[PDB]
Design an enzyme around this catalytic site. Structure first.
Site: not given
Length: 357
Positions: A122, A149, A256, A263
């Site tokens: 991703c 993210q 994260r 993202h």
């Protein structure tokens, strides 16, 4: 027409694939066969039913792939395996797909006789969709990454936990927030207390995400000190571009944050040559039709370059483009892209479209 099998179509990535395929009328060009792992539709573990297919598209996961794929290839099956999982990305008889960036690598694999096509990581895919023009002109020496993210990359339960966490943080001070004259230090003391409490749902992340961040994604790789997510930066960018004989360094920190499905990434790109900012903006913008160069203006950046704006869209905005204080060969860049689309379901949808043509 081509007989295509779908596994893991009921999961999150699979559901986005089904919806996007329905939207573009992709089912009109193929004969779909739907599989299930359930014992309550055909069985996903039936090797003989899978042998009849020309193409297999799976969003079921790595554990399924590592079990079913070697058994099916051992029967002499000559068809195409299209996967969303990481399991087969780094194999010699497999190509990592992202067609607006690597169509030439895909076309050469279709000629050589490669039957396994896998969707990429991703973070790496969203990066290449943003600053792909720079790589096309071989203007990149190295890239330093700092990611922001979303929870969707970790899973469906993870998105739910983030949302639950956000609710409990506000509910811990619901009446105090409605009072215009209340103390801010008192409010914060209470949300931090709820964040640190035993009953705060941290089961899926192993730490609080809402009102915080987690500077660690996936397992540790003792070899380089990177996380598997950070490692994919170097490994996958070069396999996608086909430049494994002359690797371009891509590394950084994968963090994260409390976003649902987009993202975002902060880059420090070192260029091999000294080009003016206006020329670099055009090179980035002209690569593909989804990348969007957002001018370095406040109002436009707040409206365009955010998870709020790009969620659920195919648009890959890139902004904050300028020269860094360490030399005019150092470029600053910030991008935002949807994880479930170009970072999961779209490259998979696109390679399938090409195989059934």
């Amino acid at each position: 027409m081509k007989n295509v099998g779908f596994i893991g179509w009921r999961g999150m990535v699979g559901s986005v694939l089904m919806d996007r395929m329905s939207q573009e009328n992709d089912f009109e060009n193929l004969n779909p066969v739907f599989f299930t792992t359930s014992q309550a539709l055909k069985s996903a573990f039936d090797i003989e039913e899978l042998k009849k297919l020309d193409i297999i598209v799976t969003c079921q996961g790595g554990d399924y792939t590592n079990e079913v794929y070697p058994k099916l290839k051992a029967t002499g099956w000559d068809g195409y395996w299209v996967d969303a999982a990481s399991a087969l990305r780094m194999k010699d008889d497999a190509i990592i797909v992202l067609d607006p960036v690597n169509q030439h690598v895909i076309s050469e694999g279709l000629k050589k006789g490669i039957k396994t096509f896998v969707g990429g990581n991703c973070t790496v895919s969203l990066m290449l969709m943003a600053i792909g023009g720079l790589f096309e002109k071989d203007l990149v020496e190295w890239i330093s990454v700092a990611t922001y993210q979303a929870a969707s990359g970790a899973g469906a339960k993870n998105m739910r936990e983030l949302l639950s966490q956000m609710g409990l943080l506000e509910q811990a001070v619901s009446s105090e927030l409605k009072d215009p004259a209340s103390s801010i230090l008192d409010i914060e003391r209470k949300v931090t207390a709820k964040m640190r409490a035993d009953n705060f749902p941290t089961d899926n992340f192993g730490a609080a995400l809402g009102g915080s961040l987690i500077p660690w994604i996936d397992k540790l790789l003792p070899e380089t000190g990177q996380t598997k997510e950070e490692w994919k930066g170097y490994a996958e960018t070069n396999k996608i571009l086909g430049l494994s004989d002359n690797p371009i360094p891509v590394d950084g920190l994968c963090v994260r944050i409390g976003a649902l499905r987009c993202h975002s990434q902060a880059f420090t790109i070192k260029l091999k040559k000294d080009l003016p900012l206006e020329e670099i903006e055009q090179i980035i913008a002209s690569h593909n039709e989804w990348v969007k160069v957002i001018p370095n203006d406040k109002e436009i950046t707040l409206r365009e370059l955010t998870p709020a704006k790009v969620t659920g869209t195919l648009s890959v905005p890139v902004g904050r483009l300028r020269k860094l204080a360490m030399g005019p060969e150092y470029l600053a860049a910030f991008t935002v892209g949807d994880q479930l689309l170009w970072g999961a379901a779209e490259p998979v949808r696109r390679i399938l479209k090409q195989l059934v043509a």
